[PDB]
Structures are given as C-alpha cells and as structure tokens.
Design an enzyme around this catalytic site. Structure first.
Site, short mmCIF file in Angstrom:
data_model
loop_
_atom_site.label_atom_id
_atom_site.label_comp_id
_atom_site.label_asym_id
_atom_site.label_seq_id
_atom_site.Cartn_x
_atom_site.Cartn_y
_atom_site.Cartn_z
N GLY C 11 0.71 -1.11 0.11
CA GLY C 11 0.19 -0.35 -0.23
C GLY C 11 0.70 1.32 0.20
O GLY C 11 0.54 2.14 1.33
N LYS C 37 -4.87 -5.70 -0.19
CA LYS C 37 -5.77 -5.04 -0.21
C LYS C 37 -5.08 -2.90 -0.62
O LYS C 37 -5.98 -2.43 -1.43
CB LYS C 37 -6.37 -5.37 0.81
CG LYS C 37 -8.35 -4.25 0.74
CD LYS C 37 -9.09 -4.27 2.26
CE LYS C 37 -10.30 -5.01 1.61
NZ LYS C 37 -11.47 -4.28 1.09
N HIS C 73 -0.81 -19.63 -0.53
CA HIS C 73 0.68 -18.60 0.08
C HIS C 73 1.65 -19.64 -0.60
O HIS C 73 2.48 -19.30 -0.35
CB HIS C 73 0.43 -17.75 0.98
CG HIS C 73 0.03 -18.59 2.60
ND1 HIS C 73 -1.19 -18.54 2.56
CD2 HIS C 73 1.10 -19.30 3.08
CE1 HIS C 73 -1.13 -19.85 3.83
NE2 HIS C 73 -0.02 -19.67 4.52
N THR C 92 3.84 -2.67 6.18
CA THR C 92 4.11 -4.80 5.20
C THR C 92 5.52 -4.18 6.09
O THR C 92 5.78 -5.39 6.16
CB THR C 92 3.73 -4.66 4.04
OG1 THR C 92 2.69 -4.31 3.77
CG2 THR C 92 4.63 -6.19 3.13
N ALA C 123 9.02 1.81 -0.85
CA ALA C 123 9.01 3.52 -1.07
C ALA C 123 7.71 3.45 0.32
O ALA C 123 6.55 3.08 0.39
CB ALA C 123 7.12 3.43 -1.96
N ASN C 125 6.69 8.28 2.21
CA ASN C 125 6.83 9.61 2.21
C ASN C 125 8.22 9.64 3.40
O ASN C 125 8.70 8.61 4.48
CB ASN C 125 6.10 10.10 3.49
CG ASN C 125 6.38 11.98 3.28
OD1 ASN C 125 6.69 12.27 3.91
ND2 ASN C 125 5.47 12.24 2.42
N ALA C 157 12.85 16.65 -3.23
CA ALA C 157 13.03 17.69 -1.94
C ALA C 157 13.93 17.54 -1.46
O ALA C 157 14.63 18.36 -1.05
CB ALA C 157 12.48 17.96 -1.56
N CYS C 158 14.70 16.71 -1.59
CA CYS C 158 16.48 16.35 -0.90
C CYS C 158 16.34 16.58 0.21
O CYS C 158 15.26 15.53 1.10
CB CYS C 158 17.68 16.95 -2.11
SG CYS C 158 16.46 17.39 -3.62
N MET C 166 10.52 5.16 -4.23
CA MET C 166 10.41 3.88 -4.60
C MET C 166 11.82 4.06 -5.45
O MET C 166 11.54 4.93 -6.77
CB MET C 166 9.78 2.77 -5.49
CG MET C 166 9.87 1.46 -5.28
SD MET C 166 8.57 0.78 -6.35
CE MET C 166 8.60 0.70 -7.52
C1 LIG Z 1 -6.73 -22.54 3.61
C2 LIG Z 1 -5.79 -21.86 4.84
C3 LIG Z 1 -4.92 -22.57 5.41
C4 LIG Z 1 -4.43 -22.03 6.19
N1 LIG Z 1 -3.44 -22.88 7.35
C5 LIG Z 1 -2.92 -22.56 8.61
C6 LIG Z 1 -2.00 -23.38 9.35
O1 LIG Z 1 -2.73 -24.98 9.14
N2 LIG Z 1 -1.53 -22.53 10.18
C7 LIG Z 1 -1.30 -21.29 10.01
O2 LIG Z 1 -0.10 -21.17 11.38
N3 LIG Z 1 -1.62 -20.62 9.40
C8 LIG Z 1 -2.61 -21.17 8.55
N4 LIG Z 1 -3.48 -20.25 7.43
C9 LIG Z 1 -3.81 -19.06 7.69
C10 LIG Z 1 -3.82 -18.00 8.52
O3 LIG Z 1 -5.42 -18.57 8.43
C11 LIG Z 1 -4.16 -16.47 8.67
O4 LIG Z 1 -2.94 -16.74 9.28
C12 LIG Z 1 -4.96 -16.01 9.74
O5 LIG Z 1 -5.28 -14.61 9.29
C13 LIG Z 1 -4.68 -16.78 10.31
O6 LIG Z 1 -5.84 -16.19 11.39
P1 LIG Z 1 -5.88 -16.18 13.13
O7 LIG Z 1 -4.68 -16.29 13.59
O8 LIG Z 1 -6.45 -14.74 13.81
O9 LIG Z 1 -7.01 -16.61 13.30
C14 LIG Z 1 -4.18 -20.92 6.38
C15 LIG Z 1 -4.48 -19.47 5.31
C16 LIG Z 1 -5.61 -20.52 4.15
C17 LIG Z 1 -6.74 -19.27 3.02
C1 LIG Z 2 -3.23 8.50 0.47
C2 LIG Z 2 -2.32 7.20 1.00
C3 LIG Z 2 -0.96 7.27 0.89
C4 LIG Z 2 -0.32 5.73 1.48
N1 LIG Z 2 1.08 6.07 0.32
C5 LIG Z 2 1.89 5.50 1.34
C6 LIG Z 2 3.90 5.26 1.30
O1 LIG Z 2 3.57 5.52 -0.18
N2 LIG Z 2 3.97 4.76 1.91
C7 LIG Z 2 4.11 3.70 2.72
O2 LIG Z 2 4.81 3.25 3.69
N3 LIG Z 2 3.05 4.14 3.45
C8 LIG Z 2 1.51 4.96 2.55
N4 LIG Z 2 0.05 5.38 3.15
C9 LIG Z 2 -0.02 4.35 4.01
C10 LIG Z 2 -0.08 2.89 3.37
O3 LIG Z 2 -0.95 2.74 2.71
C11 LIG Z 2 -1.36 1.76 5.07
O4 LIG Z 2 -0.21 1.39 5.98
C12 LIG Z 2 -1.19 0.42 4.17
O5 LIG Z 2 -2.51 0.26 5.70
C13 LIG Z 2 -0.77 0.29 4.37
O6 LIG Z 2 -1.67 -1.70 3.86
P1 LIG Z 2 -0.16 -2.87 3.22
O7 LIG Z 2 0.94 -2.86 4.42
O8 LIG Z 2 -1.29 -4.47 3.56
O9 LIG Z 2 -0.25 -2.90 1.94
C14 LIG Z 2 -0.35 5.91 2.05
C15 LIG Z 2 -1.50 5.61 2.92
C16 LIG Z 2 -2.95 6.70 2.01
C17 LIG Z 2 -4.04 7.18 2.63
#
Ligand SMILES: Cc1cc2nc3c(=O)[nH]c(=O)nc-3n(C[C@H](O)[C@H](O)[C@H](O)COP(=O)(O)O)c2cc1C
Ligand SMILES: Cc1cc2nc3c(=O)[nH]c(=O)nc-3n(C[C@H](O)[C@H](O)[C@H](O)COP(=O)(O)O)c2cc1C
Ligand SMILES: Cc1cc2nc3c(=O)[nH]c(=O)nc-3n(C[C@H](O)[C@H](O)[C@H](O)COP(=O)(O)O)c2cc1C
Ligand code: NI
Lengths: 185, 185, 185
Positions: C11, C37, C73, C92, C123, C125, C157-158, C166
């Site tokens: 993001g 997302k 994944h 991230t 990437a 600010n 703006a350096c 980025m």
């Molecule tokens: C099909 C599927 C299977 C999953 N199985 C596992 C698993 O066996 N162990 C694990 O650590 N994460 C597993 N994950 C990822 C977790 O579901 C995902 O990290 C989730 O955010 C965990 O949420 P929670 O910790 O709040 O319950 C799986 C994801 C998917 C889509």
């Molecule tokens: C308009 C806008 C611009 C964004 N630009 C950046 C960016 O350039 N770099 C960064 O680290 N976060 C940026 N962010 C914040 C991230 O989008 C926000 O942390 C998001 O949760 C990151 O999600 P992700 O890491 O799951 O993709 C920005 C947010 C907004 C609303």
C-alpha cells in the site's frame, strides 16, 4: 505561539472522557482530534468542543483522490507541535512498538520525529497493565523519547502495583502545558 | 477442583479437530471455548460438545453495553485456571509475541498472568514451521512461561526437521491434565 | 532457466508503477503478481501485462474449499525462485519484521526460506523513511538475508538523509536479473 496540539483517543473505555480532555486544551492551543475505530464505541461526538475537527480513518481517503494530493497522516504530522494519546490502549501501544501503520493514528506515529514531544496516557484494565508486555512496550516508547503520563494506581480497588485507569484530564493538560512553556515555543 | 479450562482455536486447518479436543476435556473440567474469526473457516460448530459455550469476537460486544458492565476478555481471563490454544496459528503466535489485543483471543492473552498455565499446540505448514520467526516467537513465549506442546514431526512427508502438524488431541489433553494433577488444585 | 519471479505490491503510492515493473520482468521470467488490499487504491489493473496473473487475498479462498486442497500462499512460495516486493510499505515492512501472516503477501513471506532471494524496494514519505522504525525493521530483514533496493534519496525535495521514493523499475529489474545470472540457475 498558540501551540498546535493533536489529541488522540484509542479503544479504551477512558475514551468517554476524551471530549472533556479536548475542552481542557482549546483555550490554550489549536486543537485537532484523531480517533481510532475502536475509540468510537466509547466516545460521544457531541461531547467535543464544537470548534474541534475530529479526524477518522475515513478522512485518510477524503483528502486523497489522485497522486499529488495531501496525505492526511503526513499533513497532521507536519501541523502538530505535540501529540497526546489519551487514552492509549494496550493494542495501540503494541502497534506503535511494532512500528505499524494501519490506520490514521498509527500512521501519524509511524511518521513521527521524536524531536517533537509525544505524550501518552495509557488506559487499560489492571490485568493488562500488569501483563509483562505493558512494561516492555512502554520501555521501548520511553527509549524513543515518548513521555508517559502514568495511569492512576490504587484506583477503585487499588492493590498497589500499577493499576491502569487513565490519568485525569487535568493532569494530562497541565503536564503538556508546563512542558510547552518550559520550552518549545 | 474440577478445573476451568479455556480452550481456544486460531486460523489453522487443524481447527477442524477442535470439537474433538473439547470432547477430551469436558468430563474432567468445566470447558469454555474461544475462537478467532479465521478459525471459523475450519471448525464445524455442530462438532463441539453441546454443553460447551463457544465465544467469538462478537460476544465481546454482547456482554458490554455501558460503562460498568463486564468485559468478556477480562471475565474469561479471571474465570480460567488454564488456557490451551490448539491450534496456535503462525499469525496468532506473532500477535501474542507482539503483545497485541485485536480480538477476543489475543485480548485474553494480553491480559494474562503467567502464574496461570498457558499451553499452546502450534499448527502450521512445514515451510512456516521452519521459517525463522517460528523459533523466535516460540522462544519469546517460552521465556514468558508458556508451555509448548510440539507439533508432529515426520508427519505425512516427514523430512525430519520440525514439521508442524498439530499435536494429537489425546497428547494435548494428557499433558494438561497431568500438569494439573501434579499441582495447581 | 526462465526464472519464476513473484512480484508484489503493498500500500504505497509507488504501486501506480507496478504494472510497469511487471512489464520489465515478463520477457525474461515467468511472472506472477501478488497485491495487498491497500495497494489496489493505487494500482490500475489494465496497466499490467495481459499474461500476468494477479493474485489477491480473496484468491486464498478460491483455491481452498476442503482439507487436502492447495493453499495459495504455500503454492506461490514453492513456485517462486525469487520474490520482489516493490513497493514495500512501512506497514508491510513492520508486519514482516513482526512475523505476521494476515494476508496473501505476509503469509507467503512468513512461509519463506531465506535461501531463496527476496528483494524489497521500500517506498514511503520521507518522514516515515526517517522515523527510527525504518532502520530497525530494515536491519532485521537484512539479518534474515533480504536484499534492500534503496529508495531514491534527494528525490523531489532532497534534503539528503534518505528520502523514500521507490527505486526506479529499471534498477529493481537489473538488480534482480544480474543477481540471478551471477547464480541461482
Ligand atoms: C486454506 C488456508 C489454510 C490455512 N492453514 C493454516 C495453518 O494450518 N497454520 C497456520 O499457521 N496458518 C494457516 N493459514 C493462514 C491463517 O489462517 C491466516 O494467517 C489467519 O490470519 C490466521 O488468523 P488467526 O490467527 O486470527 O486465526 C491458512 C490460510 C488458509 C487460506
Ligand atoms: C493516500 C495515501 C498514501 C499512502 N502512501 C504510502 C506510501 O507511499 N508508503 C507507505 O509506506 N505507506 C503509505 N500509505 C499508508 C499505507 O497505505 C497504509 O499503511 C496501509 O495499511 C498499508 O497497507 P499494506 O501494507 O497492507 O498494503 C499511504 C496511505 C494513504 C491514505
Ligand atoms: C468493552 C471493552 C472495553 C475495552 N476497554 C479497554 C481499555 O480500557 N483499555 C485497553 O487497552 N483496551 C480495551 N479494550 C480492548 C480494545 O478496545 C481493543 O484492543 C481494540 O482493538 C483497541 O483498538 P485500538 O487500539 O485501534 O483503538 C476494550 C474492549 C472492549 C470490548
Ligand atoms: Ni493487524
């Protein structure tokens, strides 16, 4: 002069006093408020001073439509002379110590420069206050330069060991204003 | 006597055996279950013992309407003599090591007092099990006092290096009951 | 030969150049794309090469209906010879350093084996770039073996101190291809 104070509430039951805290700062400073989604379970919007602009996660999009435009978390971070988080939830505390940016509040903080003052008034149940992550996360924030306004210990049931109710608004206010006036502007 | 056991499932494919694990504890203890939102992709609610109350993130609100009222994560934390997370996902593992509180399960844990036993049976794919965060997060939980019930190594494809399938329900049960009976009550 | 390259966007506003980056790799490698997302606020889907499959968090479910089935994944992690995150957001970055798995991108990374190359082009600010969590999180990823493709410093703006735009697609591409050709396959 006339400090620009960013006041924030996170998802603690003490956010119900957030309107009152805002009232404490408004004659002295220019106040803007930031809230987390969870804080809105506990804050009444009609309790704020009418002149205070409340920003939410959704405002991050209302400012930004196309590349070039202002990014709200960055804009609020530039604007502020000081940031006060009161209440500071256990979850927000952990997200700040984790360096995350997933909403307006943590993104302002993840863009923070610790030469600007940042005060936090943690608010949580005694059992979370006493869990070992409270001390680890607050020690980390302390090392960064945040200023802790400690919760009320001996409150309501006491026990004497920490206790977690948010510092009173009057103490949060006086602590920030005495700091300011000792120097920044 | 008749220990109060809080059983929790997180988002692992091994949550499909969670109903069975609950069945193992119910004659011996008073059981209550907590689930994460992701665990509901994998758990059949009709597989639980009919006497077991299942709590979700939404129950955090059904108990709390106004200030004063009971907060569910705190109430479940006070109630329990022991907490068993089985399965423990990689994501929940990381959120516990991060000290976060963003749902019922992590908030119970963020309110935890490590003098009460907390057992975890991690369940994840071998490639996540072998990623270096598994060992770092489990070492942290270990230092806090959590008790690891190690996953089955050599399961299904083996390779011999860890492997990650959740410990069998019978082992999780016997480990917690032998602990209990050696002392707590 | 003909490396399998997994390209990911998070993001950041620099995700608008993600289609272009994909175009750089497609003659040389088999390319698959992963997006978060938040990256979808900034990426135009019609800007990608038509032969590139774009996977989202929702694809994690479209592959998996019942136990046995392929987990996306894990499948993308096995498939890839290399992973390139460009852009890498501050959020991230923090979630990777936290060992979390809450979406397709962090779950691929939480399943990662650092003998496979993983490149990141942060990437953000300038104010987030200069916040102390940037250096702490990147030092951690560095110790794990990730390869940083540094952002453009002095951009726009350096000020000379880091700056955060980025790395250009051409540099990201050449860095990964020269690495490859020096050895892996
Ligand atoms: C099909 C599927 C299977 C999953 N199985 C596992 C698993 O066996 N162990 C694990 O650590 N994460 C597993 N994950 C990822 C977790 O579901 C995902 O990290 C989730 O955010 C965990 O949420 P929670 O910790 O709040 O319950 C799986 C994801 C998917 C889509
Ligand atoms: C308009 C806008 C611009 C964004 N630009 C950046 C960016 O350039 N770099 C960064 O680290 N976060 C940026 N962010 C914040 C991230 O989008 C926000 O942390 C998001 O949760 C990151 O999600 P992700 O890491 O799951 O993709 C920005 C947010 C907004 C609303
Ligand atoms: C009824 C209720 C009361 C809450 N009170 C507190 C509190 O006083 N302090 C705290 O740290 N967390 C409290 N929490 C948990 C936080 O609201 C939950 O961690 C939330 O994710 C925090 O979100 P935030 O930090 O983004 O605002 C409470 C939760 C509930 C359901
Ligand atoms: Ni999160």
């Amino acid at each position: 002069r006339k400090p620009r104070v960013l006041l924030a509430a996170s998802g603690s039951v003490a956010a119900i006093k957030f309107g009152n805290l805002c009232h404490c700062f408004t004659e002295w400073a220019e106040v803007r408020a930031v809230v987390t989604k969870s804080s809105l379970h506990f804050l009444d919007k009609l309790s704020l001073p009418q002149e205070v602009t409340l920003y939410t996660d959704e405002d991050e999009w209302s400012s930004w439509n196309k590349i070039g435009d202002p990014v709200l978390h960055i804009e609020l971070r530039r604007w502020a002379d000081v940031l006060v988080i009161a209440p500071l939830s256990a979850n927000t505390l952990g997200k700040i110590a984790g360096g995350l940016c997933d909403n307006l509040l943590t993104c302002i903080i993840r863009a923070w420069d610790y030469t600007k003052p940042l005060f936090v008034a943690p608010a949580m149940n005694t059992l979370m206050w006493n869990n070992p992550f409270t001390e680890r996360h607050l020690l980390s924030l302390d090392e960064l330069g945040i200023t802790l306004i400690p919760p009320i210990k001996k409150r309501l049931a006491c026990g004497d060991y920490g206790n977690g109710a948010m510092a009173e608004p009057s103490l949060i206010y006086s602590t920030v204003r005495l700091f300011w006036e000792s120097q920044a502007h």
